[PDB]
Design a protein around this ligand. Structure first.
Ligand SMILES: [Zn+2]
Lengths: 53, 44, 96, 117
RNA sequence: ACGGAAGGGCACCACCAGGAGUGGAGCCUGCGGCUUAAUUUGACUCAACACGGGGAAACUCACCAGGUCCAGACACAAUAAGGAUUGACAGAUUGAGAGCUCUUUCUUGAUUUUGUGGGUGGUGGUGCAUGGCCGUUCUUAGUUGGUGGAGUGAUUUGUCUGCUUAAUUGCGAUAACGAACGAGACCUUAACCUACUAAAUAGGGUUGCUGGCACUUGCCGGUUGACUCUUCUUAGAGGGACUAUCGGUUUCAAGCCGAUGGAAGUUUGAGGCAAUAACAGGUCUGUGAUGCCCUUAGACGUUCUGGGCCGCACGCGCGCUACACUGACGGAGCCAGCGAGUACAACCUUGGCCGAGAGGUCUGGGUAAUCUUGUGAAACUCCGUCGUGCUGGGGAUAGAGCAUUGUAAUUAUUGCUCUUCAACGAGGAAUUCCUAGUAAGCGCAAGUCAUCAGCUUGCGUUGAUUACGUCCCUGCCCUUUGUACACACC
């Protein structure tokens, strides 16, 4: 409704986000995952990652 | 903020730009619309 | 909640044909996907539904889900005025 | 398309990871071990192994018929390409996920702490 | 459980034999103190201090300085169109083409506004109300129950004088007999295979077509023209190692030590997984994981805009670059491996022109053993210039401009171009890490990333000196002794 209600958020840390909740810190963007490093340890083997060595 | 100074039955010429849609507002040689935000200057 | 009532009846419309709504959590968006209304307009409409009977919903992975109960189908028939033998998703269209 | 093979293989894993998380919520009341997806040509077989099979299906296509429409709007699919079946579980004793749901009920109802174990 | 009590063991998070150095210098960056309107919070001995994947230009963001917004779901009730209330250019207004409203009388037609309940939201409060996960006691050798014995009983032997092992690992001695968990086994990776099974996205030979060359047969090639194959190369599927075979040395037992064969002889190298029992160790600042207390619109929810997280007499902690001649400054020579990479975005980006640089531009190719890419990367090699003088070593402070990424670079973002040319002649007590493709030089790639490595996690080149033992020091495990301790010597 109001005119000014945004910023150029097409880059940096504020615009980027995870899939689960939306944390702006500790973000894995490798291979287009977008799941933060706390939840990645929980969901490693379901995706297919394993601790071989 | 405000209650809008509500008062029904109020109480004139139609719009030049639009069709039979909105009426003009009478002031001391000053005019502006309602729906099309506010786009008048000269008297009509 | 401050929604001109032309837009609110279009949310009941689109719910009744398909029987499912998958609304994103993103507020301050130009318009919703598929349906031609705002995201804040759509979420608050289905938010008001949950209080007065219905609707089966979640808050998971930034995706609000909404699927109507049996009494919820009867409520929507009153406003939109459709009598009986209609769309929803209790029974299939034909072979599916 | 046309996407690299490394990106789609990781994206395949997250697609399933979402599906497994929602069915934990949605099939909490009716029992739920997991999901097994098998992407054949055109169609996709999604086998849900659960204890109460007929309740997961519903009243001759109601629960699963609504759930198939949900998966389409989430991940962008057409009517025909997805088919949600319901099969029985190979025993409860070995399948340790089934005991957690029974234990969750017994604490929520109001049963003994030690004698449940 | 302690012991400023005694025996026997073990570890470069101990020490010997040594190597590199940090503590000294300048500067990068965390933590204090000071500072401040705000200089946002966690963390405190090993187990806080380049840690929160924390490199903040606004977002981030829990903090100030000054403002906007309803995003008050809903139960019922006060005006309920003689409007519930929604919007509103123009200039006073206002950081301001925020109707923010105070100047205004048109819109808008029951969505709501107005009471009392009711919430929803929170990088609000408590890690001493909790759950998960991580840390540490400890990657150490330790822990349990079944019959049988010794005890009225708490309990106890089994789980032990010895000798070995990296290890309660095994031999042997016996009120003890057999068993389980931990370790070992298992799994992943690095080596060996001219024997299988294979490929113009891997490389070689036969040869052709062809380009040049020494002029005899032969040398260097340029084409994915043809034919065929498997040494390198990738990766299936197998074998190879079992201390093998000998020699000494041991109740001549279990092992350990000297040869020989062998690609491999420290568990063949390194990691991955990791017992019972705990600590009131860390996290409510990953969370629609969360108890209840607070906060619930004049908002500690919010939303936009400037400013700070980086203030500077002063301390400690990791770090980078130097204190030059085994060197610096020139050409010439010229070799790796881990990775990574857009089509709905703006990724890696050769080749060609413009430019003393940085970087401009035309074009591609690549969704990736196909194109960047042979990621011809550094240190190095070899001839010249300087030579032991704060010097041509060293690069900090400084000023002007030329580039780039951004809505925005003044509180130098980042790089470049000439000038400015200091501090430091091998570092006091102390003190950390380390037994072989390791140590220490050396760069490269990734992680965060619109733009920013002096950081962390990974890779390959250059490749030592010195033990091959011991409880003297600092702490860990058992046994035997003593206790007026048992939230257990704080
Ligand atoms: Zn008009």
């Amino acid at each position: 409704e109001n005119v000014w209600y945004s910023h150029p958020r097409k880059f940096g840390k504020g615009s980027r986000q995870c899939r689960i909740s939306g944390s702006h810190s500790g973000l894995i963007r490798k291979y287009g995952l977008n799941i933060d490093r706390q939840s990645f340890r929980e969901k490693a083997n379901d995706i297919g990652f394993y601790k071989y060595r | 903020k405000h209650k809008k100074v509500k008062l029904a039955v109020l109480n004139r010429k139609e719009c030049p730009n639009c069709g039979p849609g909105i009426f003009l507002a009478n002031h001391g040689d000053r005019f502006y619309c309602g729906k099309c935000h506010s786009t008048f200057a000269t008297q009509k | 909640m401050l929604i001109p009532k032309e837009d609110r009846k279009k949310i009941y419309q689109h719910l009744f044909q398909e029987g499912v709504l998958v609304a994103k959590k993103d507020f301050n968006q130009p318009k919703h996907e598929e349906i031609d209304t705002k995201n804040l307009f759509v979420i608050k409409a289905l938010q008001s539904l949950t209080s007065k009977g219905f609707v089966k919903t979640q808050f998971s992975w930034q995706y609000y889900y909404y699927t109507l109960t049996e009494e919820g189908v009867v409520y929507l028939r009153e406003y939109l005025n459709l009598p009986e033998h209609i769309f929803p998703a209790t029974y299939l269209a034909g072979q599916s | 398309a046309i996407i690299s093979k490394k990106r789609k293989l990781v994206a395949d894993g997250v697609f399933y990871a979402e599906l497994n998380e929602f069915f934990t919520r949605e099939l909490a009341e009716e029992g739920y071990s997991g999901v097994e997806v098998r992407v054949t040509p055109t169609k996709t077989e999604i086998i849900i192994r659960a204890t109460k099979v007929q309740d997961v299906v519903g009243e001759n296509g109601r629960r699963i018929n609504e759930l198939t429409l949900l998966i389409e709007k989430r991940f962008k699919y057409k009517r025909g390409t997805i088919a949600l079946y319901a099969e029985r579980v190979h025993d409860r004793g070995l399948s340790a996920v089934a005991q957690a749901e029974s234990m969750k009920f017994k604490l929520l109802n109001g049963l003994a702490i030690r004698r449940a174990a």
